[model samples]
Target: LNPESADLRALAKHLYDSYIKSFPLTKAKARAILTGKTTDKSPFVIYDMNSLMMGEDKIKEVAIRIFQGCQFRSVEAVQEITEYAKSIPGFVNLDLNDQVTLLKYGVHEIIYTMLASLMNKDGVLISEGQGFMTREFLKSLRKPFGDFMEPKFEFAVKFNALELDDSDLAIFIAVIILSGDRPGLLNVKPIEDIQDNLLQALELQLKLNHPESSQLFAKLLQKMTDLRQIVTEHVQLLQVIKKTETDMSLHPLLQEIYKDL
Candidate 1:
């Protein structure tokens, strides 16, 4: 496909424009809200300790509750992505086993990518603008618990530093979802072809979007590597939490994924 052709260019533009319209806020506005650079009129805030009014003895329980909330949100995000994946034209036509395998492994990476949009140098927006999880707060968690989320925050913040717009992200996300490298894929070539076209389209779009930021494309590619590592740490953290916090519970889907690890 000649990326230089008009029809392909229009398809890429439409793909990006529709995504931005569906998500009305620009990256700048999202960053403003995440960092408190602008007032978030939304009614959400981080879970308040004073309101819970629990003592030190219940801190572990509180941590568990917080982790549960995070996992629940993550699960919901993955489901949304599943629906979104199906909506993409060719994605639904892939082999059933391949589709499941892609979603199983790729969901976390995409979730983390989307999370980058809500992140700033300080922290990430959570709970539909009702809560903000600061980088420091994540690091303050007990041993392995703290270790689990810090990498995500670190990668998210750095990725955000690249300052990509929603259009750039939409194309990148499509590429991520169609990844051919995931284990257990029955047919790799077709998926790879899709990924290849997506990447070419992404590069063309990035050139159009950020003509002045010459390094942005390379930086975005590096961030994919960073996301892979972050999610790897995330899985390791989940394993430790499940093992050490036996009294606590994990979502069934999350537990099943961990078993494969």
Candidate 2:
């Protein structure tokens, strides 16, 4: 159950604390936004029914604008994940190619998982807490791409119901990034050992934090499988979007990762 070293444990805790401080929306604030009682709002609806009559070109324009906003947020989110990965003890010590491989495959999964924290049963938080994009709104948007977001929202709504706190999420994100299963990892055992230690730590933390919820730790682990399925669908959707929406450009980092995957 112990970390590879005392230094690893200490660094994880410190980074987890720092991440919590920098997160824009607290659970309470997210709840307020979802309940329609928040004042800090952004002008990004997935689509308006009133706009349904808009021409195809106009619809494409609106969709691309929303996608650009999402791309911008995802870039920042990936950067944060990169910083945390580098800070973890032994992560930066990995072979350069392996490090790049892991980040390429793992970053999007971690991003979506962490985004689950900002979700409720209705939808997800966006625009750095200035907006809430409802499940209904997202579903209503035009075709293949809009359909792509539904599965993600569905997963987030269920995951959010679990109510994991910041500490649980931080450790889980670490465990995902250190996965030994990612293709092209040169040093598998070290990564696996770290993941095992993280799993033990996550289980112990859950017991301390949710003493009555005996099954919560196991449930969280199971969510990893669910996340994989969700992300697979997301990647497929992105492939479709990339081909069909040739008029719009995806974020370069996202485009790289999506094509690589």
Candidate 3:
């Protein structure tokens, strides 16, 4: 808000520090980075859902197992995103229902983008490097189910190339969580204000940190539009599957969030 250049830089850093505190890194990437291999020999067993199978002859069998993994990831990620929104300054001031509304809509967008960290051109590392699920295996399950996931990898591959650090991801994620476009928001103005502040801070942070990447800020904004499209189609894909595949409707937390809450 001030005209001083030094203070402006100072202000964005201040905003960034808070975002980083609110958003923490996942252990999956931590273990991978420590070992320098995407697939490692660590004995850490953090993810305790059904162990995803290596290969399957039946399409329904593969789709069901992987979709369960998606819910396994979704349930935890949704809870984390819910809590992440709470610590932000203005978000806590909004109505309780509005809080749920924002996360209910935005959590997937956040989760999808963050999926890049655990992913590469080959596969996404799971179980903290205990498993590497290949693009070929996932694609073999066929469309509607598998198609819901391919854009995720495609976007993940491209977005990871931007080489954003944890803090940059934190602030950009804040921009999406606090977006006013979500349905059922009664307090749009304040949410919009906070998101705009975060966005401007993000623009400054990018200019300071990656001055070589001249259009990085604009490119990130474009990615947000792309994320909205992916998440929108994902909702439709879920609609397509939830009725057909009833064995595990979803993890209950995900069920409520996926429902019309």
Worst 10 residues of 1 by lDDT: 50-59
Give the clashing residue pairs of candidate 2, or none.
none
Error of 2 at 122 (Å): 2.0
For candidate 1, give the lDDT of residue 132: 64
Candidate 1 residue 89 Cα shift, in angstroms, is 2.5
Candidate that would win on TM-score: 1
The parts of candidate 3 lying over 4 Å away from their true place are 1-60, 142-144
Clashing pairs in 3: none
Worst 10-residue lDDT window, candidate 2: 51-60
TM-score of candidate 2 versus the correct structure, residues matched by position: 0.83
Candidate 2, residues 83-134: lDDT per residue as tens digits?
Answer: 7787656788888888888888888888778777667666666666655566
RMSD (Å) per prediction: 4.0, 4.5, 5.2
Give per-residue lDDT, candidate 1, residue 170: 77
- Please give each candidate's TM-score: 0.85, 0.83, 0.80
Computed on alpha carbons, the lDDT of every model, listed in order, comes to: 0.72, 0.72, 0.70
How would the candidate models be sorted by TM-score, starting from the highest? Answer: 1, 2, 3
Backbone clash numbers for all candidates listed: 2, 0, 0
